[PDB]
């Protein structure tokens, strides 16, 4: 019963960026990422591939696993919400390095190549596209807050925190505001990495959740809540 | 209780990782990989594009780590592209580093099973149909197929029957690997989905539909 618009042709949604603070988006912060390089050539320190070297460094190799970050970013970036252009990923390395992930990027799915990207990114501080038009991965200055939208809700994943329905929270949250999630890619540790930034911590399920599963779990609720399909 | 192929009455979410690209080669037996073994596979003449087992690893990781599996309502099956069918005990916990997963698979394929002291990973005889529950609904993931809500879909189906989803871990190819067994094909998301993402999406609906939490 309604006349159709002037132009029905689907257009690619603008790619969200840190400069833009008005648009609603779902921010995910992969805190405590274990991404470190060392000359042997520079190689991403790995939990299994390198054991003696990290012992020489004195770092507990249990918290030396970047594959968790690789899978979490893989499950994130491939999510439909990215394909709808409503998500931005931020990575906070355990050392204190903050990395902005352009939604357009595509990490290699193979872990070995992923390590090659990380060492390239950490040393050059930036990654350029094949077509050479945009910097997909860029290291950015801390604190995280300045990059986040002016009006934004901050939350972390806490197993001890009350178990919630991710879908329900997103509808009752206001529209112009955005939601920022801090996810611990650590294999184990105390969930206080983002306490100083966050305002309230939530648990997603009664049972323990993997970081990749929780990241995938959270985005699905937003897509259901925002009708992203 | 831990769900098994012998028990058919119980409701469960069955996922079949069809066209799985797992293969062992000796120069000692090692799982073939797109990156680790290129010149060797070039000498085979097979394209390295279809030499990528990590999709099965990632998909099995997300499926195994999902709340539904922890709730004892999910069983995983893997149909290798060579024609090998593998049953995955829900109790298992695979290695998450890909290298240790590959060493497990070569152990699984050559010894035909894994025992750690029930059989964690066991190679089973084809076809899949005999193993699956007696009353069960079968679907595949097809991009061209109509988009359907996984929550609404599972709700509208009956309770005694079980659900099979046939997911293609394969890199490229026509979505006809499981046409013979399946009765209809459904679309999960409006956009193209990776196998792991679609598996992550589907178990979300079952968890919401069944109130697994």
């Amino acid at each position: 019963q309604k006349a159709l618009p002037a132009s029905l042709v689907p257009q690619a949604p603008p790619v969200l960026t840190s400069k833009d603070k008005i648009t609603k988006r779902m921010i995910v912060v992969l805190a405590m990422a274990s991404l470190e390089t060392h000359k042997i050539k520079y190689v991403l320190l790995n939990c299994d591939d390198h054991q003696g070297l990290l012992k020489k460094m004195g770092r507990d190799i249990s918290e030396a696993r970047p594959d968790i970050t690789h899978q979490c970013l893989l499950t994130l970036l491939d999510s439909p919400i990215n394909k709808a252009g409503k998500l931005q990923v931020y990575i906070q390395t355990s050392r204190g390095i903050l990395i902005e992930v352009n939604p357009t990027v595509r990490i290699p799915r193979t872990f070995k190549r992923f390590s090659g990207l990380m060492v390239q990114l950490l040393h050059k501080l930036s990654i350029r596209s094949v077509n050479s038009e945009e910097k997909l991965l860029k290291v950015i200055k801390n604190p995280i807050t300045d990059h986040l939208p002016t009006k934004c809700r901050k939350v972390t994943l806490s197993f001890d925190a009350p178990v919630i329905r991710v879908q329900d929270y997103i509808e009752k949250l206001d529209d112009d505001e955005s939601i920022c999630v801090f996810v611990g890619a650590m294999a184990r540790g105390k969930d206080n990495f983002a306490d100083e930034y966050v305002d309230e911590k939530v648990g997603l399920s009664n049972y323990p959740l993997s970081a990749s599963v929780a990241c995938s779990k959270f985005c699905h609720g937003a897509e259901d809540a925002w009708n992203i399909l | 209780p831990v769900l098994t192929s012998k028990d058919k009455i119980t409701k469960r979410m069955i996922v079949v990782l069809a066209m799985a690209s797992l293969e062992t080669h000796k120069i000692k037996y090692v799982l073939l990989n797109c990156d680790d073994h290129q010149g060797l596979l070039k000498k085979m003449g097979r394209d390295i594009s279809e030499a990528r087992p990590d999709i099965t690893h990632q998909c099995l990781l997300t499926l195994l780590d999902s709340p539904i599996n922890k709730a004892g309502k999910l069983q995983v099956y893997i149909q290798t592209s060579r024609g090998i069918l593998i049953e995955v005990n829900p109790t298992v916990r695979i290695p998450r580093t890909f290298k240790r997963f590959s060493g497990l698979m070569v152990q699984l394929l050559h010894k035909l099973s894994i025992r750690s002291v029930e059989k964690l990973l066991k190679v089973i005889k084809n076809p899949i149909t005999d193993h699956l529950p007696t009353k069960c609904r079968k679907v595949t993931l097809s991009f061209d197929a109509p988009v359907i809500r996984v929550q609404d879909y599972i709700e509208k189906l009956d309770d005694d029957e079980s659900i099979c989803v046939f997911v293609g871990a394969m890199a490229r190819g026509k979505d006809n690997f499981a046409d013979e067994y399946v009765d209809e094909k459904v679309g999960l998301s409006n956009y193209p989905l990776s196998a792991s993402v679609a598996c992550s999406k589907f178990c979300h609906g079952a968890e919401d539909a069944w109130n697994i939490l």
Binding site: R106, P108, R109, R113 | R52, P192, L193, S194, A195
Partner: peptide, 11 residues
């Protein structure tokens, strides 16, 4: 255009 589960090209 790459789609779904494609890996970036390796040279």
């Amino acid at each position: 255009r790459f789609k779904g589960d494609d890996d970036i090209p390796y040279k």
